[PDB]
């Protein structure tokens, strides 16, 4: 990406900057770690390192942040379930179909 | 949108479900709660009201999720300096200048 983010512009994970004399790099790890290399010797970071960072973005409103990707806070939890629909009945009752029967009720 | 929800949809934020005889609905809030309703009553919810929840997804693992927006972990603090960019300087500093000079760096 070179050496320079303006306003609205985004590392990804992968992506990075660069010093002009290529000494330095500052790239988004898949680990989620925002870390600045000097050569291959990490000097500093975002200690961002575990998480689930997907972008660093140099903001609009001239704020340069770190997100993390979307998190589920409520699941059927019915995972493995195949060809899944979720219906709310006339009976009042909501209900996720798969191919094996119903899976999931309010009861 | 129907009363059905199938693999790789999902309510949107304001979107819902209605039943057949039209009696009871389920829609995601502003709030961010999934609630349905009968009539005038609420009678179930997720109990997601207030959070930043963004979509209730039918998904292709079968799996029916809501999910919150993407969250801050990290910034620079400068929110309200204008015609930002983010440098990596050759002296291996790392700055964001704004319109009124250097606003952060390392």
Do not use: C, I
Request: charge should be negative; proline fraction near 2%.
């Amino acid at each position: 990406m070179g050496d320079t983010l303006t306003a609205g512009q985004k590392l990804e994970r992968g992506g990075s900057l660069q010093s002009g004399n290529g000494a330095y790099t500052l790239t988004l790890q898949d680990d989620g770690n925002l870390v600045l290399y000097a050569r291959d010797k990490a000097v500093w970071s975002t200690g961002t390192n575990g998480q689930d960072v997907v972008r660093a973005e140099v903001q609009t409103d001239g704020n340069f942040v770190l997100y993390t990707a979307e998190k589920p806070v409520w699941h059927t939890d019915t995972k493995g379930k195949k060809e899944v629909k979720l219906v709310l009945q006339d009976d009042r009752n909501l209900v996720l179909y798969a191919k094996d029967g119903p899976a999931w009720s309010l009861e």
